[PDB]
Design a protein around this ligand. Structure first.
Ligand SMILES: N=CN[C@@H](CC(=O)O)C(=O)O
Ligand SMILES: N=CN[C@@H](CC(=O)O)C(=O)O
Ligand SMILES: [Hg+2]
Ligand SMILES: [Hg+2]
Ligand SMILES: [Hg+2]
Ligand SMILES: [Hg+2]
Ligand SMILES: [Hg+2]
Ligand SMILES: [Hg+2]
Ligand SMILES: [Zn+2]
Ligand SMILES: [Zn+2]
Lengths: 451, 451
């Protein structure tokens, strides 16, 4: 197949009259700027690479917005987490699949073309395994396929309630595997994910949930071809407990004990001191920034300006899914730095003064790296994952190049995304998804069941 | 005419099956819950009072998002302001009217049903008065009428470049009036605004732009019934300069020298120290918080939790119009408090633990007070300004009462606003405004002329 764009953001920058040839397997096979359409499909607006979503817990969308009730004068991340635990205790395999389908459809409409599902709900209601231990992982994969979104599934190793190998709590019963069972599940998933065109990654929930011994064991188990994700340094309490148990801060500890490199996505990394920021940047690991969730949970503001200045790599994740908006995450990534510094125009490069373009370039690259997928740019030999903005929008139509990105990211919104393609397949057209009605009906029923 | 809502937010709380009778003048004549439809038009979702927007500079929407380019390593409010001055120097009366109409249509679609236009663009390109001195004020009124939005026009007294009566800069030439001309403008405006069903307020740009004698003179002129608005304490430099000229901070100074009370809207008030916060709350003045613009400009975070705890009244304004979203302003008012305190659930009342409802209640009340209009409440005698949320949305349909406000404000977005009524007239239906097409055509042409 082929498509033709009056305007498109290519790796070398904005181009005009670009004809893209797309192979039968959904890969960009030829890209010719300043070309004739030559039989290709007419696109309706500015074309951008699709945005990877590098961190998701799908089921949490079912409770999004419901935890905004003061139950204490100092409501915490930890009281939120207990409510989340109560939600997860109720979910059937069928409900998990329905929620994921709805969520991924909404992600696609926002311009997220691929997702890293940080998946820790493994077992049945009593913590006992399913007949097929991969049951819930397979539901996630089936949901991604139905929506048509790219997927890196990250089954999560979760074993403990806290540092020192503290026994798992009752509320964590559905998450729990030892190292051996986890490595089995991981190996078991390779074939079905591959058959669906999906990717896999290694994942430790956090330094609270797994022991140093388990990390060492898993990293030595021969899955060197996979990304590695972990929640780290999100909350001050984790920092304090790490110090108590190890004499180090969380990121400091990880870097001292593990060969962190480009395979790694460090989710949140919120409490990173200057030495930790520098170590992250040196290593080439990707900071997984989840701006809307971090604000919602009162985590704090990441030192993004310091990190970026030193060549840090980052991407964005919707995480608890209170927000599903590429616009919101990038806008408030920048705005948070502005509020902290009380200055404007914080996140730019030495070779790129445009804020919107800086943010988009950064999150594309980091997102692609964290997912371990051939995405994040419109280049020959990368997958045909793209967005088409509204060519009829007066702001976008009057803008050119990087100014168009500024209008969208800082003055516009989600509904400026009109059409979306993933793996060379049209999955959103005129803001609508072919499965949205069926999904909404199933989803509203599930929401009722969960009350 | 009559409308019927299965769910509606009334002054006493959520109600069911409410029949509204609206008189010919757009005033709520009868409201009764637990009623039958009886030929009244059945509405398509949850009904809320429309949200007043208490602070706007219409023309700024034309440059929204365009000032996101790093020029300096420490770009500031002041370098932004210079770019804004360059934009304003080019605007014709026709262009101003076109931008205002487009903006107001977008406000309506977002759920803003009335706007306070803090209007300081008065004169021609060379600073000379128009044949009718009120020309540009009239363009604003005409635009609000065309869009169908409620309007409190705040013509702005602007006379100086800084404290001490510093002569106006060349860049400020279009804004400038002495006290005599300003007081004449107010009188000229009374009849046409009344004829259009619009309101009027007194307005000082800031303590930088007018002198203490000018303030006293204007306040002694007998317009004792009008709202009084002022930008105050937005930036540190204003605080420092006020201290240098008066030995006080800006808010401290105002409260020491002027009888501030319930008529007043203090826009931004960002740099309010604890004594200043207390005096604001005691006075019953409305804090005009413009969250998206304050973040965009790097102003900082208002002490909203301290203010609210003391009975403070607030409303929201879109200001520079980088964002036109009731959702975004209320959401990030709360999230800003969460990021600062590193805690959740910050803005609630002793009698209302629901965060969304607290925010909505507050901004409705402060917004109505600040505009001086009989709005912000679905009660008999108040104007029929309302929005209808999407009853087909699965998140909203599965929720009830205050939980529905939480889903919308914290998990949803603008797209969930479907129908909007102002003065008993439908101005948005199923997300569409009748003037949108003509408006966008004219607006895109203006955007081209401004480049
Ligand atoms: N935002 C954090 N969420 C985490 C909580 C945790 O780290 O325990 C989670 O979903 O597992
Ligand atoms: N956000 C601030 N804007 C103000 C600037 C000022 O106070 O000089 C204004 O548009 O007049
Ligand atoms: Hg499904
Ligand atoms: Hg589905
Ligand atoms: Hg540790
Ligand atoms: Hg107009
Ligand atoms: Hg118009
Ligand atoms: Hg002063
Ligand atoms: Zn997470
Ligand atoms: Zn303003």
């Amino acid at each position: 197949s082929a498509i033709f764009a009056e305007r498109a953001l290519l790796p070398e920058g904005w181009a005009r009259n670009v004809r893209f040839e797309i192979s039968a397997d959904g890969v960009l096979a030829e890209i010719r700027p300043d070309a004739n359409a030559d039989g290709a499909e007419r696109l309706g607006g500015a074309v951008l690479p699709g945005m990877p979503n590098l961190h998701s817990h799908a089921f949490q969308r079912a409770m999004a917005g419901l935890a905004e009730v003061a139950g204490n004068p100092n409501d915490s991340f930890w009281t939120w987490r207990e409510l989340m635990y109560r939600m997860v205790a109720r979910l059937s395999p069928e409900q998990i699949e329905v929620i994921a389908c709805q969520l991924y459809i909404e992600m696609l409409k926002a311009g997220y073309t691929a997702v890293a599902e940080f998946h820790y709900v493994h077992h049945d209601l009593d913590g006992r395994s399913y007949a097929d231990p991969a049951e819930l992982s397979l539901r996630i994969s089936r949901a991604a396929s139905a929506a048509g979104i790219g997927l890196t599934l990250l089954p999560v190793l979760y074993s403990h309630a806290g540092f020192g190998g503290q026994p798992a709590s009752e509320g964590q019963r559905r998450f729990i595997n030892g190292s051996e069972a986890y490595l089995e599940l991981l190996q078991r998933l390779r074939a079905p994910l591959e058959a669906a065109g999906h990717s896999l990654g290694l994942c430790f929930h956090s330094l609270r949930a797994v022991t140093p011994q388990q990390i060492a064991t898993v990293l030595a188990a021969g899955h060197d071809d996979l990304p590695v994700h972990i929640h780290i340094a999100e909350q001050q309490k984790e920092v304090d407990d790490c110090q108590a148990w190890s004499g180090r801060r969380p990121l400091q500890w990880l870097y001292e004990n593990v060969a962190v490199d480009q395979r790694w996505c460090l989710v949140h990394a919120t409490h990173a001191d200057p030495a930790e920021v520098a170590a992250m940047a040196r290593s080439g690991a990707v900071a997984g920034l989840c701006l809307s969730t971090e604000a919602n949970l009162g985590d704090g503001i990441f030192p993004a300006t310091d990190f970026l200045a030193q060549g840090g790599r980052l991407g964005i994740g919707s995480d608890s899914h209170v927000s599903l908006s590429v616009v919101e995450e990038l806008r408030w990534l920048e705005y948070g730095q502005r509020l902290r510094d009380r200055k404007r125009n914080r996140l730019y490069r030495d070779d790129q003064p445009m804020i919107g373009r800086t943010l988009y370039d950064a999150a594309l690259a980091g997102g692609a790296q964290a997912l371990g997928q051939p995405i994040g740019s419109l280049a020959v030999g990368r997958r045909a994952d793209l967005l088409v903005l509204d060519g009829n929008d007066p702001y976008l139509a009057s803008a050119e190049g990087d100014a168009l990105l500024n209008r969208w990211l800082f003055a516009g919104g989600d509904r400026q995304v009109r059409d979306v393609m993933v793996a060379g397949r049209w999955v959103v057209r005129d803001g609508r998804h072919a499965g949205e009605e069926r999904s909404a009906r199933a989803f509203v029923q599930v929401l009722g069941e969960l009350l």
